[PDB]
Enzyme design. Structure first.
Site, PDB file in Angstrom:
ATOM      1  N   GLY A 155      -3.151  -3.070  -2.772  1.00 46.21           N
ATOM      2  CA  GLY A 155      -3.955  -2.051  -2.075  1.00 46.21           C
ATOM      3  C   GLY A 155      -3.326  -0.668  -2.176  1.00 46.21           C
ATOM      4  O   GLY A 155      -2.173  -0.573  -2.565  1.00 46.21           O
ATOM      5  N   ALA A 156      -4.061   0.411  -1.867  1.00 48.35           N
ATOM      6  CA  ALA A 156      -3.423   1.761  -1.895  1.00 48.35           C
ATOM      7  C   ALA A 156      -2.404   1.829  -0.778  1.00 48.35           C
ATOM      8  O   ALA A 156      -2.785   1.678   0.372  1.00 48.35           O
ATOM      9  CB  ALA A 156      -4.443   2.862  -1.704  1.00 48.35           C
ATOM     10  N   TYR A 157      -1.122   2.074  -1.111  1.00 45.46           N
ATOM     11  CA  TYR A 157      -0.044   2.250  -0.101  1.00 45.46           C
ATOM     12  C   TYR A 157       0.253   0.990   0.734  1.00 45.46           C
ATOM     13  O   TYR A 157       0.813   1.069   1.853  1.00 45.46           O
ATOM     14  CB  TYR A 157      -0.406   3.351   0.921  1.00 45.46           C
ATOM     15  N   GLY A 158      -0.143  -0.175   0.248  1.00 42.15           N
ATOM     16  CA  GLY A 158       0.037  -1.365   1.077  1.00 42.15           C
ATOM     17  C   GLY A 158      -0.177  -2.682   0.327  1.00 42.15           C
ATOM     18  O   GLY A 158      -0.300  -2.711  -0.887  1.00 42.15           O
ATOM     19  N   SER A 159      -0.203  -3.779   1.058  1.00 39.89           N
ATOM     20  CA  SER A 159      -0.434  -5.113   0.485  1.00 39.89           C
ATOM     21  C   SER A 159      -1.665  -5.675   1.127  1.00 39.89           C
ATOM     22  O   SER A 159      -1.892  -5.397   2.251  1.00 39.89           O
ATOM     23  CB  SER A 159       0.711  -6.047   0.827  1.00 39.89           C
ATOM     24  N   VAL A 160      -2.389  -6.532   0.418  1.00 41.16           N
ATOM     25  CA  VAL A 160      -3.708  -7.003   0.877  1.00 41.16           C
ATOM     26  C   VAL A 160      -3.767  -8.503   0.832  1.00 41.16           C
ATOM     27  O   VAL A 160      -3.361  -9.134  -0.155  1.00 41.16           O
ATOM     28  CB  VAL A 160      -4.843  -6.465   0.018  1.00 41.16           C
TER      29      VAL A 160
ATOM     30  N   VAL B 139      -3.923 -11.216  -2.086  1.00 38.09           N
ATOM     31  CA  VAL B 139      -4.826 -10.880  -3.194  1.00 38.09           C
ATOM     32  C   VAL B 139      -4.343  -9.647  -3.960  1.00 38.09           C
ATOM     33  O   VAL B 139      -3.316  -9.090  -3.596  1.00 38.09           O
ATOM     34  CB  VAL B 139      -6.269 -10.667  -2.719  1.00 38.09           C
TER      35      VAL B 139
ATOM     36  N   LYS C 115      -5.337  -4.994   5.089  1.00 45.22           N
ATOM     37  CA  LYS C 115      -4.306  -4.356   4.254  1.00 45.22           C
ATOM     38  C   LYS C 115      -3.211  -3.923   5.238  1.00 45.22           C
ATOM     39  O   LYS C 115      -3.551  -3.268   6.228  1.00 45.22           O
ATOM     40  CB  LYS C 115      -4.867  -3.095   3.523  1.00 45.22           C
TER      41      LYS C 115
ATOM     42  N   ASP D 298     -10.708   3.429  -1.958  1.00 45.66           N
ATOM     43  CA  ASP D 298      -9.434   4.238  -2.157  1.00 45.66           C
ATOM     44  C   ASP D 298      -9.843   5.633  -2.426  1.00 45.66           C
ATOM     45  O   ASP D 298      -9.136   6.353  -3.037  1.00 45.66           O
ATOM     46  CB  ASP D 298      -8.567   3.811  -3.351  1.00 45.66           C
TER      47      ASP D 298
HETATM   48  C1  LIG Z   1     -11.352  -3.964  -6.107  1.00 45.86           C
HETATM   49  O1  LIG Z   1     -11.384  -4.892  -4.971  1.00 45.86           O
HETATM   50  C2  LIG Z   1     -10.900  -6.142  -5.158  1.00 45.86           C
HETATM   51  N1  LIG Z   1     -10.447  -6.516  -6.257  1.00 45.86           N
HETATM   52  C3  LIG Z   1      -9.957  -7.767  -6.328  1.00 45.86           C
HETATM   53  N2  LIG Z   1      -9.420  -8.353  -7.426  1.00 45.86           N
HETATM   54  C4  LIG Z   1      -9.043  -9.668  -7.147  1.00 45.86           C
HETATM   55  C5  LIG Z   1      -9.364  -9.912  -5.865  1.00 45.86           C
HETATM   56  C6  LIG Z   1      -9.172 -11.205  -5.142  1.00 45.86           C
HETATM   57  O2  LIG Z   1      -9.672 -11.397  -4.021  1.00 45.86           O
HETATM   58  C7  LIG Z   1      -8.396 -12.334  -5.815  1.00 45.86           C
HETATM   59  O3  LIG Z   1      -7.422 -12.078  -6.535  1.00 45.86           O
HETATM   60  N3  LIG Z   1      -8.759 -13.676  -5.708  1.00 45.86           N
HETATM   61  C8  LIG Z   1      -7.794 -14.713  -5.331  1.00 45.86           C
HETATM   62  C9  LIG Z   1      -8.705 -15.912  -4.970  1.00 45.86           C
HETATM   63  C10 LIG Z   1     -10.038 -15.205  -4.791  1.00 45.86           C
HETATM   64  O4  LIG Z   1     -10.182 -14.561  -3.526  1.00 45.86           O
HETATM   65  C11 LIG Z   1     -10.075 -14.203  -5.945  1.00 45.86           C
HETATM   66  C12 LIG Z   1      -9.954  -8.647  -5.367  1.00 45.86           C
HETATM   67  C13 LIG Z   1     -10.432  -8.329  -4.030  1.00 45.86           C
HETATM   68  C14 LIG Z   1     -10.940  -7.084  -3.956  1.00 45.86           C
HETATM   69  C15 LIG Z   1     -11.479  -6.601  -2.588  1.00 45.86           C
HETATM   70  O5  LIG Z   1     -12.474  -6.980  -2.033  1.00 45.86           O
HETATM   71  N4  LIG Z   1     -10.712  -5.506  -1.947  1.00 45.86           N
HETATM   72  C16 LIG Z   1     -11.420  -4.879  -0.794  1.00 45.86           C
HETATM   73  C17 LIG Z   1     -10.338  -4.584   0.271  1.00 45.86           C
HETATM   74  N5  LIG Z   1      -9.240  -3.864  -0.412  1.00 45.86           N
HETATM   75  C18 LIG Z   1      -8.894  -3.986  -1.678  1.00 45.86           C
HETATM   76  C19 LIG Z   1      -7.876  -3.176  -1.973  1.00 45.86           C
HETATM   77  N6  LIG Z   1      -7.593  -2.451  -0.771  1.00 45.86           N
HETATM   78  C20 LIG Z   1      -8.375  -2.903   0.146  1.00 45.86           C
HETATM   79  C21 LIG Z   1      -8.567  -2.376   1.542  1.00 45.86           C
HETATM   80  C22 LIG Z   1      -8.880  -0.981   1.779  1.00 45.86           C
HETATM   81  C23 LIG Z   1      -9.075  -0.671   3.090  1.00 45.86           C
HETATM   82  C24 LIG Z   1      -8.957  -1.601   4.161  1.00 45.86           C
HETATM   83  F1  LIG Z   1      -9.329  -1.274   5.375  1.00 45.86           F
HETATM   84  C25 LIG Z   1      -8.618  -2.866   3.981  1.00 45.86           C
HETATM   85  C26 LIG Z   1      -8.391  -3.210   2.613  1.00 45.86           C
HETATM   86  F2  LIG Z   1      -8.125  -4.535   2.400  1.00 45.86           F
HETATM   87  C27 LIG Z   1      -9.591  -4.876  -2.608  1.00 45.86           C
END
Ligand SMILES: COc1nc2[nH]cc(C(=O)C(=O)N3CC[C@@H](O)C3)c2cc1C(=O)N1CCn2c(cnc2-c2ccc(F)cc2F)C1
Length: 330
Positions: A27-32, A26, A47, A159
């Site tokens: 992050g700060a300093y990483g991939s999600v 679908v 992430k 973040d």
């Molecule tokens: C701002 O947050 C978002 N923005 C988005 N934009 C598009 C999104 C789609 O999911 C997406 O592209 N799709 C693809 C298909 C459908 O899922 C829609 C989308 C998802 C989120 C979202 O819930 N996130 C929460 C976890 N997250 C995120 C960044 N960093 C982390 C994170 C930080 C701490 C950690 F412990 C773990 C982490 F994963 C974003």
């Protein structure tokens, strides 16, 4: 110890417990990746930190984020559902995966909104900042792309504690040792944009950015000028053609007059006079949502680590400790 499995997604290796299925990028300093958590039935976001011990910087940032995420327990703040490493010892420890709720969009993706929608989004951001700020943590880069919003319009702040258009002028120019209201400035820029549909201050550089700000809020008066250290900052500011504060009632015409009042109190140039998060929650604009009995503050947060200079291996070891001692939520 869970059984792990590996796959490649987008040239990056993901090695996670078999608990987590259907990984999809679908992050700060990483991939999600989004994933399905078989154990709880929850849709989660995972992430993977990118090169978490590359340098002292990466290592201390890895620790910092793990410690922050472990401490945050609030409905409008991202917190930890799980954290894991495939390493079976400290010696072999080179990867960190962090699990939280999947919201699935950002505030941009939700956006020109209606007043009741704006009320509820900004309410939640302020309720989340009240909690973060009470732990003496500032966001510093609050912006529509790190506000994660689900289809129910429920919001969490992402973040925070890690760090153009949403940044307070006193961080643009390096003014008075700023306070937690840098983040209030950004909420004001965000709320503005939700109400009008347009970026309030779309500068092209730090310079153009400050020019756009003071066009709305006026150039500093002598009361604020007195509080500026830099001959440079002061020189620059006072050498500009001087500008009055606009009538926000006129600039935000059409908007709920209560919201325009609130924006005036968030977008003050003098950080010392800007409304806090807790004050904003009490503002009449939020009467439909505000409840002093359900806007919690955070437990004490120990950031003494920030003022220490350690070796990579010490930060790695401390991070590993924090991985081991992680306790799930009920
Ligand atoms: C701002 O947050 C978002 N923005 C988005 N934009 C598009 C999104 C789609 O999911 C997406 O592209 N799709 C693809 C298909 C459908 O899922 C829609 C989308 C998802 C989120 C979202 O819930 N996130 C929460 C976890 N997250 C995120 C960044 N960093 C982390 C994170 C930080 C701490 C950690 F412990 C773990 C982490 F994963 C974003």
């Amino acid at each position: 110890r869970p059984t792990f499995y590996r796959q490649e997604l987008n040239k990056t290796i993901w090695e996670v417990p078999e608990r987590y299925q259907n990984l999809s990028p679908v992050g700060a300093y990483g991939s999600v990746c989004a994933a399905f958590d078989t154990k709880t039935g929850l849709r989660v976001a995972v992430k993977k930190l990118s090169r978490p011990f590359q340098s002292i910087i990466h290592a201390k940032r890895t620790y910092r984020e793990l410690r922050l995420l472990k401490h945050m327990k609030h409905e409008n703040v991202i917190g930890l559902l799980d954290v894991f490493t495939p390493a079976r010892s400290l010696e072999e420890f080179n990867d960190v995966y962090l699990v939280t709720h999947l919201m699935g969009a950002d505030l941009n993706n939700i956006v020109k909104l209606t007043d009741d929608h704006v009320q509820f989004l900004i309410y939640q951001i302020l309720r989340g900042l009240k909690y973060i700020h009470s732990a003496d943590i500032i966001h510093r880069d609050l912006k529509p792309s790190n506000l994660a919003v689900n289809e129910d319009c429920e919001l969490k702040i992402l973040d925070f504690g890690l760090a153009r258009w949403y940044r307070a002028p006193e961080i643009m120019l390096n003014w008075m040792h700023y306070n937690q209201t840098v983040d209030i400035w950004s909420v004001g820029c965000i709320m503005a944009e939700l109400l009008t549909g347009r970026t309030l201050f779309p500068g092209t550089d730090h310079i153009d950015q400050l020019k756009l700000i003071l066009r709305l809020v006026g150039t500093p008066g002598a009361e604020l000028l007195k509080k500026i250290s830099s001959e440079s900052a002061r020189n620059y500011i006072q050498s500009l053609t001087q500008m009055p504060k606009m009538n926000f009632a006129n600039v935000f015409i059409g908007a709920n007059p209560l919201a325009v009042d609130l924006l005036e109190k968030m977008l003050v140039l003098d950080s010392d006079k800007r409304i806090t998060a807790a004050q904003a929650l009490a503002h009449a604009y939020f009467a439909q949502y505000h409840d002093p009995d359900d806007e919690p503050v955070a437990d004490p947060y120990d950031q003494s680590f920030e003022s220490r200079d350690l070796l990579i291996d010490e930060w790695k070891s401390l991070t590993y400790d924090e991985v081991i001692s992680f306790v799930p939520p009920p």
